[PDB]
Amino acid sequence: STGSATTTPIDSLDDAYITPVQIGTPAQTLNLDFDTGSSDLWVFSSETTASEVDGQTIYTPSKSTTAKLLSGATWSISYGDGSSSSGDVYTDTVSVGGLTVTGQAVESAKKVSSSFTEDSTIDGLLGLAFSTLNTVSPTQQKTFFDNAKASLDSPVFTADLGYHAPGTYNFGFIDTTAYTGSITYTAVSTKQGFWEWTSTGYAVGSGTFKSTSIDGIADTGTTLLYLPATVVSAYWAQVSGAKSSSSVGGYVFPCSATLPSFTFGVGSARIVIPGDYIDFGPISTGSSSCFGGIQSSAGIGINIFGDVALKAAFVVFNGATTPTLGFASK
Numbered sequence: 001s002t003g004s005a006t007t008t009p010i011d012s013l014d015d016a017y018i019t020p021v022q023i024g025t026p027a028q029t030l031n032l033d034f035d036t037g038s039s040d041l042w043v044f045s046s047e048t049t050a051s052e053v054d055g056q057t058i059y060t061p062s063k064s065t066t067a068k069l070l071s072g073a074t075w076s077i078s079y080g081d082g083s084s085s086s087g088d089v090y091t092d093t094v095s096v097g098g099l100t101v102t103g104q105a106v107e108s109a110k111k112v113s114s115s116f117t118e119d120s121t122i123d124g125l126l127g128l129a130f131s132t133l134n135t136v137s138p139t140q141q142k143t144f145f146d147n148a149k150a151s152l153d154s155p156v157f158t159a160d161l162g163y164h165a166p167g168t169y170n171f172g173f174i175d176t177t178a179y180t181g182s183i184t185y186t187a188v189s190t191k192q193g194f195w196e197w198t199s200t201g202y203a204v205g206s207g208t209f210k211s212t213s214i215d216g217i218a219d220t221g222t223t224l225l226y227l228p229a230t231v232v233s234a235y236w237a238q239v240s241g242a243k244s245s246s247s248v249g250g251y252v253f254p255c256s257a258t259l260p261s262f263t264f265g266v267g268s269a270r271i272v273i274p275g276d277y278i279d280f281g282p283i284s285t286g287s288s289s290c291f292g293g294i295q296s297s298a299g300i301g302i303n304i305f306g307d308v309a310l311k312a313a314f315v316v317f318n319g320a321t322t323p324t325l326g327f328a329s330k
């Protein structure tokens, strides 16, 4: 089997991407944030505290003839951005882009933190990291991909995120028309439950490539590119007037600037992030200070190849017995 679904930016900055997901019978379609940095499929629901729902589409398990309470199971998750959610669990039929999993754990939110409430466009998350990170207790649950894997034509999914445009998540096949050149594969460590890999270096603009190992995670659920402070400083030093602002919470730059590209290494291959991908616009409406798309990972504890990096590539998440990651230009 295979599946193919379009993923769409939630706003003009590509802050996140939403992908329609069919849950239950008859189908309830919710727009979920596919997150390769976590492993819970959770949704706004009929159980979510009413004051914490503001425009989201909810899953109502009592209206699904295939929903079953997973008795005694609870979940609770906190994300790198400080947001969180928790609740109980149903199993139900879940389909993405024509690919159907029966008995998928659908984690129903009883509580969500303010950032979720305030984002009316995201109806929940669909985790695509390794199932060892799933938070369901006392019986850990499998991700949608892990449940689908054996049925797939090939045990893979791909992320093809757009810049200010829709893109695609495919399951079970590699669309050879969706990228240019060849795909370069690189080793993954699953020791922390992430799609963790080691970039071979970077360049800033037309500058020379610096060979250096940068361990990080491929994370579709993180907006920006978070790298060591040394690398980030080298990038922003090439933008007149750029500076790190503790009050704003990272590097800002004059909105009048033209940003240089940023290149990252994948083995001997190179992925180029155009400068425009690094512009996240005014820090507040009407401001001439703009927020940067490359930020320091110091204090996070891990480097994160988020959407800014991933949307410059066609990315293969290879879930074979020994997982690997593939990157191609497009």
Ligand SMILES: Cn1c(=O)c2c(ncn2C)n(C)c1=O
Pocket: 013, 015, 223, 224, 248, 249, 280, 281, 282, 283, 284, 291
């Ligand atoms: C602080 N900040 C962000 O954290 C941010 C942003 N755009 C995207 N992000 C993530 N802007 C404009 C911003 O000012």
